Design a protein around this nucleic acid. Sequence first.
RNA 1: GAUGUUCAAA
RNA 2: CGCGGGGUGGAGCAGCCCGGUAGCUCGUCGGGCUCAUAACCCGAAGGUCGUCGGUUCAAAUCCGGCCCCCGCAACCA
RNA 3: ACGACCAGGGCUACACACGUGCUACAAUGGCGCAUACAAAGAGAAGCGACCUCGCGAGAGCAAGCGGACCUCAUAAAGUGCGUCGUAGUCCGGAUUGGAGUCUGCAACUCGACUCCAUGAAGUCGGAAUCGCUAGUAAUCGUGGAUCAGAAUGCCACGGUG
Lengths: 115, 67, 177, 84, 100
Amino acid sequence: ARIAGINIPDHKHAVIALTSIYGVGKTRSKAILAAAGIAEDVKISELSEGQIDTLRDEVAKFVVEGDLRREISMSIKRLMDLGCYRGLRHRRGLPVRGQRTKTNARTRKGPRKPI
Amino acid sequence: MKKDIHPKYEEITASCSCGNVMKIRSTVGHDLNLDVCSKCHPFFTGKQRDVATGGRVDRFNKRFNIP
Amino acid sequence: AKLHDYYKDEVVKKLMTEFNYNSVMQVPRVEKITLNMGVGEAIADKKLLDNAAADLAAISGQKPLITKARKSVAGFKIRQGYPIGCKVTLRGERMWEFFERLITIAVPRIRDFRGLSAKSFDGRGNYSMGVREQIIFPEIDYDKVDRVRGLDITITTTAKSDEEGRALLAAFDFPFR
Amino acid sequence: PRSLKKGPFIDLHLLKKVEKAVESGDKKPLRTWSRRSTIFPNMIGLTIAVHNGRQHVPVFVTDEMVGHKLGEFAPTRTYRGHAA
Amino acid sequence: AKQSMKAREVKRVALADKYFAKRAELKAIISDVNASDEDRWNAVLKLQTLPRDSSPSRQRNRCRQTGRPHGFLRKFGLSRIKVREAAMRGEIPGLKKASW
RNA sequence: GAUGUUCAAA
RNA sequence: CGCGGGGUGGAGCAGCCCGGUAGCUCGUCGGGCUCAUAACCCGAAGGUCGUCGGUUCAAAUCCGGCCCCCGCAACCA
RNA sequence: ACGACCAGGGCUACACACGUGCUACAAUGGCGCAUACAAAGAGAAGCGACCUCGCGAGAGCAAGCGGACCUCAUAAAGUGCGUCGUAGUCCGGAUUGGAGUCUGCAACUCGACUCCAUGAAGUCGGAAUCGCUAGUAAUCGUGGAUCAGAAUGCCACGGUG
Ligand SMILES: [Mg+2]
Ligand SMILES: [Mg+2]
Ligand SMILES: [Mg+2]
Ligand SMILES: [Mg+2]
Ligand SMILES: [Mg+2]
Ligand SMILES: [Mg+2]
Ligand SMILES: [Zn+2]
């Protein structure tokens, strides 16, 4: 299956396929299906790629895929040009929220590096 | 000028937030939109500083009202 | 040649009155505007000199010229005949196109501005200035370049005296201090 | 984050000195120890040297700066590297 | 340097008593109330002009007998070690060793 | 079942 | 000059013949065991093999060129 | 002046190792719905129902309670139902962007929580090493003190076993 987004959702439970789509969370998946009205408890028969036509227009109201990524990039480049502490952690690959660097900061710094 | 070696150079129209539009010959290849020009600059004998122009400054103002 | 047409229509008569010249030819003019970039990391990374050259090629339409070192120097660990700098000399309509672009866009785009030193002239009327960041020119897309280097702009002028040189650029409305 | 209802946070001495400079034109940097104060549109285009324990560090205010605290930009610790 | 910390704590409880009931409550409520507008801004201004030591949060709970910052228990107003010794001397009423 | 030195007086 | 041998992890040594993608020993660094140290144990990193070509699906491996070292024999402008 | 009064910072920095915890690596589980029980304790600069609005953290209004009465605050695995069907997964949650709540003079360094998005490592861990003999380990919830605010710790409590 395909959606308005560039990435293609898998053929399976409709809610799960949307969670996988970038930019759309499980809760946002439920938001647009509430507007679309397509539930999984309806007749499974008569299901086609034509049906997601309503999905194409309603998802477009939410920034997703490349649009969100562009937003993330502009937010981080601004941080770098600002000279703020928040930007500096981004540059050095260090925690950006105030978590301890002494220990338990592996996700930010990366694999262990010998002295 | 020697052919081939020199970058392509066509005319482009660069617009400004103040509304001034300048036709400039540059190698950008695209009509970029800029914010500050010579006319809207405090040093270039500007009467109205860029403070009047909006942006995320206006967004800060809508959230916090100090009238 | 936007700033050229202005010069021969208004600047010429403007300078003519305040100096009491005898001939139009006496009125100084801008001969050439050499743009110079220097890469001390060319010996370390020759690729960086090519990237700086690509930046100057974007800033000014004319293709950049690679300057080899004039003489070997011990302090800078350089050898004669080794590419080190990058220079473009603008003398025609493209000189005027760069000049009008610099005043209209590059000078405002500078982060913090307090005026351009009127004192910074070679003493022969030829104005030399230094650009701290290459990103100010809109030619290079911001965040599309490896590092933010700088350049040196020199306005060689017919004027034999600094006083004639300042008034020529001032007539163009150059942002002097 | 300060609550929206309470509005933005600013120090009296900081705001008073900013208004005293704006009316008399930009001329000198405002040396302040108030890192808690928020960056305001009124002080854009000015160099506020927010205090860093050892010595004040100069910051030039910009439009993107507004919505962030004065101290947030300022260095608060020096750690160049573990290696010499 | 314990005496200097105690000399400060006596100033903080004196100033808080001086100011907590005269202006602290009103400046907070007129800032908090949604209906109030503009004045809530001016109210914050006069608040910062105050000494700032009045704040009850400037006060730190400390034993009266030994002026100790940590180990303080409110009911006894004493530090943990002071409570233990007093309980054994029988000074604290109803306090016995606990078994269960 | 490897190796483990020393230590003024009151 | 002829013939034979050698160069592979910091070092040393295999693997070579009979091509199947390269190990060990010792050292290094980190951990463990012990009151502590050694021994020991575990994990990690390190060269794709003196170099350059050819061959081939594929080369430390096979055949040449070159460099250095060594053994023996040879040398009447 | 090894005294004292102040404002800002630091004790939360971080090539790195160790100690003790937490959360996992799923299907005896995750998700959604329906539905069942505690014991212990704390409260007047305090617990704060109900009601209205907010997806919500919350805000407003305001009953009652110095406490077998009021309020936290009612439990969780459990049971019954549907789906996942073994996949880095309807596992797992790091991390990060955006926005808001609350405390507090103020949350930038340096608070917690909510929402929207993101979905790292991890498919059970090397040499080695710890705790526990019965309601004990194991597991699952609850309360307290400290406390303006700030638990995964700590002192208690019950559930299954
Ligand atoms: Mg004493
Ligand atoms: Mg306190
Ligand atoms: Mg202080
Ligand atoms: Mg500490
Ligand atoms: Mg598991
Ligand atoms: Mg608390
Ligand atoms: Zn403009």
